[PDB]
């Protein structure tokens, strides 16, 4: 991975998350489960769809008959006609092969960037109220119910609200 | 601490320029350049500094043969290309076939 998130510090993907491309696995006393981040998933789908549409829609053609008929005394123009067809075949094949090769690399890195951004967005929200434990995972120093959980998914986590609750727990785990 | 904050940011303006990207269409940008030419001065000009050869009332067949509806060049003349308006009709006034017309037109182009 270019950004080191997919197949990087997040070692593997989740098959339990089927409603989206990127999301979360939560765990609290109320239970545990998988959920997909609606905001980041939809913004990545739009880019990919635009990417596919751009490749296809920019190719606009018109009515044209390739077939040309020549006699046995018109070899040179027949060879000229063949030279035109073969040259177009080589040009289109090389561009099409390289376009897919380069864009496939771009698409995978695009997913890598989105996963990395989502982790950093959560990191900026929690700050020192949570401990990074690898695998793209956070451990809360304070209790976090279902309302607190989706509030991170909402994007509306209240750091000062649990700042003193987490700070007291922070200085006791580390002896 | 006595405040004393420092910020990192980027530039913004009022430009309404919109560009198209592979992932998103109509993205507004601060500055942009145009790579396409779509304007013409609407006048036939002097390529290589040499003025073209204009016929007007005649096609190339009429001018090269000397049709009475055509002019001729007496002095030493030069041209870079040939202008022949579609209104040109007074060519081979006497009916007939002019051999290698297209070949002669290309050889007389410049």
């Amino acid at each position: 991975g270019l950004f080191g998130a997919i197949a990087g510090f997040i070692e593997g993907g989740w098959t339990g998350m089927v409603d989206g491309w990127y999301g979360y696995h939560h765990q609290n006393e109320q239970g545990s489960g998988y959920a997909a981040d609606l905001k980041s998933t939809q913004n990545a789908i739009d880019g990919i769809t635009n990417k596919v549409n751009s490749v296809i829609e920019k190719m606009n053609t018109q009515f044209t008959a390739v077939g040309k008929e020549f006699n046995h005394l018109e070899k040179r123009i027949e060879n000229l006609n063949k030279k035109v067809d073969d040259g177009f075949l080589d040009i289109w094949t090389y561009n099409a092969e390289l376009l897919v090769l380069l864009e496939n690399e771009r698409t995978l890195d695009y997913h890598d960037s989105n996963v990395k951004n989502l982790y950093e967005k959560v990191r900026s929200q929690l700050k020192n109220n949570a401990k990074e434990i690898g695998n793209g995972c956070f451990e809360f120093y304070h209790k976090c119910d279902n309302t607190c959980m989706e509030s991170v998914k909402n994007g509306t986590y209240d750091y000062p609200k649990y700042s003193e609750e987490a700070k007291l727990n922070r200085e006791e785990i580390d002896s | 601490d006595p405040g004393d904050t420092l910020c990192i940011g980027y530039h913004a303006n009022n430009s309404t320029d919109t560009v198209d990207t592979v992932l998103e269409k109509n993205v507004t940008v601060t500055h942009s350049v145009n790579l396409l030419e779509d304007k013409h001065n609407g006048k036939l000009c002097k390529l290589r500094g040499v003025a073209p050869l204009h016929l007007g009332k005649c096609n190339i067949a009429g001018w090269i043969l000397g049709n009475p509806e055509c002019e001729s060049l007496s002095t030493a003349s030069s041209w870079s290309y040939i202008v022949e308006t579609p209104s040109s009709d007074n060519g081979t006034c006497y009916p007939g076939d002019f051999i290698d017309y297209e070949e002669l037109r290309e050889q007389l182009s410049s």
Partner: nanobody
Amino acid sequence: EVQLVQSGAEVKKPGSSVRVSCKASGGTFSAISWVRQAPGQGLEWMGGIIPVFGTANYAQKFQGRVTITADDSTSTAYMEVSSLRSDDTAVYYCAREETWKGATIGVMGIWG
């Protein structure tokens, strides 16, 4: 731009099934959503399919009966509903998520 041409009107009896076509004038991979309006009632989104994410998201009422599908080469969308009943006598629409921004998932954009 691309233009949407849906299939023609069809009349059937309860218990049968019907599939509705949605052909694109050009070629595009924008998302597909089907919306129904019953006589004298409001609009009602039935389901949707994301060509790039696969899958087919439907509504709770229509899940089980409707089957929304699309083909890539023809850029044609198909909406099939089984176990037809007199409650489904209505007019059905086909829309593609598309605005000046681009794919813009969620918004119907161009309609049929």
